[model samples]
Target: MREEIGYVPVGEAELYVEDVGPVEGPALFVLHGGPGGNAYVLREGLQDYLEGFRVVYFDQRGSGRSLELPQDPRLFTVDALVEDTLLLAEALGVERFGLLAHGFGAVVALEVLRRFPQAEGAILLAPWVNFPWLAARLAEAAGLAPLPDPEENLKEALKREEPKALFDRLMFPTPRGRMAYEWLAEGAGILGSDAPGLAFLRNGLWRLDYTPYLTPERRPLYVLVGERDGTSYPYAEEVASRLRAPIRVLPEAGHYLWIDAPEAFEEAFKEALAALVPALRGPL
Candidate 1:
């Protein structure tokens, strides 16, 4: 129930951090989606479910609620984000932690898991690890045939429609769900800078494919996805399979599973939490 909200200096950025729950509780880092997204929505939606754990929610550099950086491509690499995560844990004095990553954050979480023994494991929700696959899906959503090249497909799709409109169609199953998400996001005043997204695009984010990094992991790893999530469903299946992890697919739900199908999402999330309970209990 206790909460600490402040900024923590990590590298050139001072990350916006909200550390919640008891200090002695199991630590879990909640990684929000987007190269630009903040942690507000994830905290708002999942806080009740995370009662017993120590949850650290923070905005990435130049993202929502975080100190903005210059519009430089050098400041927004995936490697920088991974290092930021590590530095953040060190700053908070958290030696070991689990990860709960969504969408683009899955890319960061997996990389941390791969490189750091201190990162216990992860739970990926509607993860978007393969940018090429996602770009083709965006092309299809825009009513265009997917191009062989991921960049070309993404460019074509955006030319036909705004990225938000296209992604909304793929991420929400109903108008109500979309409204819920938009309302929360707007209420949180999440006016994040476009620099991270733009910088990543300039750096060839579409060319990134983390599938090769999905080799079998010794630590606990789980995935939860919406069956109808056009943005990340079938690809998430491949991601889960390659990681040799258990995946729970909620029927009829879309990308925002908590909003689109709370009941199912709660059930699936509980199962994931139970499976990770041992690791979360911390090392002996």
Candidate 2:
């Protein structure tokens, strides 16, 4: 396998991007959530299987390695972030490819499909389609309204038992996941600090109706959400229902669907990826 990493200049900032696997293989630009969240963990999570495709991971502007930290909210809006991704695609010379988006990344991924229109497809997980829905749902689970601070909430959520046999499981709960969330909270201070991605997370959500863009006839879209996910699972299901996109609610999972329940995620994942055959398997 080949591995390459570089800082590509896109707009006013340099994005930290990396490519792994065959050069001519199927390509997917992987996006991680958190306006302040980075892509390293996502890359690490998916490292076991690449399906021979060249997967690209970049810390979107103000997050991870593309840092210009102590972010200026003016430059981190949804529009700017979208442009950063588009410019990154242009810089990398990717004309058509799949998008694997998680959490807040889903917000940007749908827009990519909307603006580009001709990409092969999109694989969205635990999508954060509506900010209001996400905030309210998570807050209820956390035993609060308007959500506690990210660091405090994440810390407390991890010290509890996994809820099951219950209809609703809210709150962002996971020890490892909290580590990332905490860093994002600090890096972005948005909910409270000068966090760049936090600001984006706060302001850059549901700018356009994505229902029209991802239709049955337009392109393939598969959304897999954890049945137990209280953060964005319900929102994802609602979006999938309205858009008529294929969706699956994995059992015993939460916001970290893949990491939380790998076996079930694989069952849904394998099925979802199979849907992308031929186009994704081109010349492989």
Candidate 3:
């Protein structure tokens, strides 16, 4: 297949994407998290364990090769995100495929699922359910105040454009500065080093919610979460219970599961593909 990189125009900007693996292979469109985090690292081999799946990894607006802007928070809303996902699917001619979303990426997929329910299936890794969930969990894990109080601080940060404060307010288990944060996919730095993406993520997540897509109708799902995640294990449990989706608890893993436990992460990731898109699993 043509793994050569290309761009699809979206609004005033063009979306950058790459097709890896055979064209005939089942198309797997990855909706990456990170309102600003790069998706480049989560490429090809990312789905390699998925056998015959043709993985497609693309950068979201203002992140990787996608468009960027100044004070363009409107460009980062959930509706806009769903629009972009559909547009990308149309551009690539992908009818159905599993969605493997991480962090904010899950929010994107969930939002899109609400409006257009056509992702053969979906998997959420440490998904941020909504403000109420985040607030409650953050309060328990990071000593944050209850409900609106915790979320209030979060909202205040975004309203004031306090990126760092926003990041701190959102990050779980309390960020460890610039310490070596490891995950299977990549070894990234701490919150402050998250830089550009953190800025966008702070604002993007400030508005994230899962109310639109939480039904048994959307089931045959996968929900994975880290044991020590700052978002708290209860968050994942609540999400899994709320959606009635299958859950996999990854102990010793963090928010960036693939980065912290690459091997196991790869296993779970490919396992989802195997179960949802058997055509791509192949004989062992």
Instruction: Tell me, by lDDT, which candidate is best.
Output: 1
lDDT of each: 0.90, 0.68, 0.62
Candidate 2 deviant stretches above 4 angstroms: 69-71, 142-194, 201-217, 278-284
Give the Cα error of residue 208 in candidate 3, in Å.
4.4
Error of 3 at 102 (Å): 0.5
lDDT of 2 by residue, 1-284 (tens): 78889888886778788877887888888888865667876776666656688888888876667746444567776667777777887888877788888887887887787777546777888887665555444445556544334433333433342322111345335656445545744664333123774565456442333444444435777888987777676667677876567899987677777777778877887777767664665311
Q: What would you estimate as the lDDT of candidate 2?
A: 0.68
Q: What TM-score would you give candidate 2 relative to the actual structure?
A: 0.77
What lDDT would candidate 3 get against the real structure? 0.62
TM-scores of all predicted structures: 0.96, 0.77, 0.75
Per-residue accuracy of model 3 over 145-223 as CA lDDT, tens digit each: 5456545655543454454443333443334421333242245321222333555456656455665467664435678
Over 4 Å off, model 3: 136-144, 155-208, 211-213, 278-284
lDDT string for model 1 (1-284, tens) is 69999989997898999999999898999888887888998888778789989999999988889998975789998999999999999999999999999899999999999889999878899999999999999999999998899999999999999988999999998999899989988988767988988899899999999998889877888999999899889999999999998899999899889888889899989778777756456421
Answer with 2 or 3, whichever has the higher TM-score.
2
True lDDT of residue 93, candidate 1: 97
* Weakest lDDT window of 10 consecutive positions for candidate 1: 275-284
Candidate 2 residue 69 C-alpha distance from true site, Å:
5.9
Q: For this target, which candidate reaches the highest TM-score against the unseen true structure?
A: 1
